[PDB]
């Protein structure tokens, strides 16, 4: 047979997660890339980045430890 | 072949007004191999990206370090648990001091689970835990030089994801019980994913299972590596087209609530047939509390039927079905919601969504090597009420 019955637990919830469970990241490599100010201005990347609204959006990855704040560089 | 960078005020800006614009909080992952010749970390460069947000009024919330498990093979130097718990102490320190009201910090950022990377988290916990909000760690399933589609498909694949978390808690349990464990970066392969699959409709498997898991098992937020780059595990690719598992992101966001129950198969559990079960997202306007969002994936290569149990067997019940579209099939970039390509009508306007209302009392119908979400209307169930 194909068909297949569901049981379900509704009594209580198990967990509770955030409101931002699905959250998303930028590697911080990217901010290595020369376009980077204008590729994040993008209109369509801004309207599809407040489609998963509300959500962290974390800035890391490898470069983390690579990379250093220029207070001076223009 | 050296990694090392600067960037600068602007792209700090640009990177916080991209994050306020979109309705996304930023975590910003602070260097910690800026170290003193006491082996401290060195504080002086976070210092000044503090100040310079502080005086901007950015709300931030800060990480230091990513990946500290492997600082001896990445960069020849080897930071132990404790010394980076130590450093966390640091940052934290230099948070309150600050002007910004309640910065999070989040650490440590570490590898999933094998033998020495538990020991670190565990270490890491005992000196440092006390001043985190959340404990986060990094998954991956497969290496992206190597995966097949078959590995994209294989339920025992999926399962390893298991007991990687189930290590993690028990790390956590036995130190910090009840502090938050978060997936801070996590995709279906490392090394930029792999190509011509990360990116596909078959990426999707692995993606909502990895949220139905985590749901289930206590992990509290799940931080998809990437939102957007160059990575072929991207939702967004550097051409602004969104990819399949972007569609299927923005479908859990809006169905899939907080509040995680629980559904199982009856009876013999092949794990290729894999059901989920939270109340249904609250924001959502066509839904009203009490309402169910059930998730599921088929990974058999025939079509499964889905009998609700009583009393929800009568309901009425929306599919929201996503099938790929074109002739790549499972590796198609291309997705289809009830039988429409999911496309943006412009720039700004993201598509409707729009559900199929299915006949009350039909078994759900799942087809061969798809997934979907079923949302069961009136359920009436006081624990989501």
Redesign the interface.
């Known amino acids: 047979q194909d068909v297949v019955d569901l049981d379900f637990f509704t009594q209580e919830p198990l967990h509770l997660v955030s409101p931002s469970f699905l959250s998303v990241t930028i590697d911080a490599n990217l901010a290595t890339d020369p376009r980077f100010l204008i590729l994040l201005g993008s209109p369509k990347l801004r309207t599809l980045a407040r489609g998963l609204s509300p959500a962290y959006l974390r800035f890391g990855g490898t470069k983390t430890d690579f990379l250093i704040f220029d207070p001076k560089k223009e | 072949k050296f990694?090392?960078?600067?960037?600068?005020?602007?792209?700090?800006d640009?990177?916080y007004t991209?994050?306020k614009?979109?309705?996304?909080?930023?975590?910003?992952?602070?260097?910690?191999?800026?170290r003193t010749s006491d082996g401290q970390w060195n504080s002086s460069?976070?210092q000044?990206?503090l100040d310079?947000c502080a005086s901007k009024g950015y709300n931030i919330?800060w990480?230091l370090?990513?990946?500290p498990n492997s600082?001896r093979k990445?960069?020849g130097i080897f930071i132990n648990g404790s010394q980076l718990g130590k450093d966390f102490i640091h940052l934290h320190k230099l948070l309150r001091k600050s002007t910004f009201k309640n910065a999070k910090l989040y650490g440590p950022?570490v590898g999933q689970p094998r033998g020495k990377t538990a020991k670190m988290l565990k270490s890491f916990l005992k000196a440092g835990g006390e001043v985190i909000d959340a404990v986060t760690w990094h998954h991956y399933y497969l290496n992206g030089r190597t995966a097949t589609l078959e590995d994209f498909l294989n339920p025992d694949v999926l399962d390893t994801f298991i007991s990687q978390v189930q290590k993690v808690l028990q790390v956590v349990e036995s130190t910090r019980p009840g502090k938050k464990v978060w997936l801070?970066?996590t995709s279906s392969a490392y090394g930029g994913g792999a190509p011509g699959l990360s990116d596909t409709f078959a990426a999707g498997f692995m993606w909502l299972d990895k949220?139905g898991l985590?749901?289930?098992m206590?992990?509290?937020?799940?931080?998809?590596?990437?939102?957007?780059?160059?990575?072929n595990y991207h939702?967004?690719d550097?051409n602004?087209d969104?990819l399949p598992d972007?569609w299927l992101?923005?479908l859990?966001?809006k169905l899939?609530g907080?509040?995680?129950?629980?559904?199982?198969?009856?009876?013999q559990d092949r794990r290729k047939?894999r059901?989920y079960?939270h109340?249904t997202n609250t924001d959502n306007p066509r839904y009203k509390e009490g309402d169910?969002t059930?998730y599921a994936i088929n990974l058999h290569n025939?079509?499964?039927?889905?009998?609700?149990?009583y009393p929800?067997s009568n309901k009425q019940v929306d599919q929201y079905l996503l099938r790929p579209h074109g002739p790549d099939g499972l590796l198609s970039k291309s997705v289809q919601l009830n039988g429409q390509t999911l496309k943006?009508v412009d720039?700004?306007?993201?598509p409707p969504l729009k559900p199929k209302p299915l006949r009350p009392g039909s078994?759900l119908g799942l087809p061969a090597f798809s997934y979907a979400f079923f949302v069961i209307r009136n359920a009436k169930?006081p624990?989501?009420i």
């Open positions: 990694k090392n960078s600067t960037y600068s005020r602007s792209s700090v640009v990177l991209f994050a614009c979109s309705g996304l909080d930023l975590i910003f992952g602070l260097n910690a191999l800026l460069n976070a000044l990206l310079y919330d990480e370090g990513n990946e600082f990445k960069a950022d801070g970066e949220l985590s749901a289930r206590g992990i509290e937020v799940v931080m998809r590596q990437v939102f957007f780059g160059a990575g939702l967004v550097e602004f969104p972007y992101s923005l859990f966001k899939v907080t509040k995680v129950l629980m559904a199982s198969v009856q009876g047939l059901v079960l109340c169910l059930l025939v079509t499964k039927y889905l009998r609700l149990p929800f943006m720039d700004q306007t993201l078994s169930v624990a989501c």
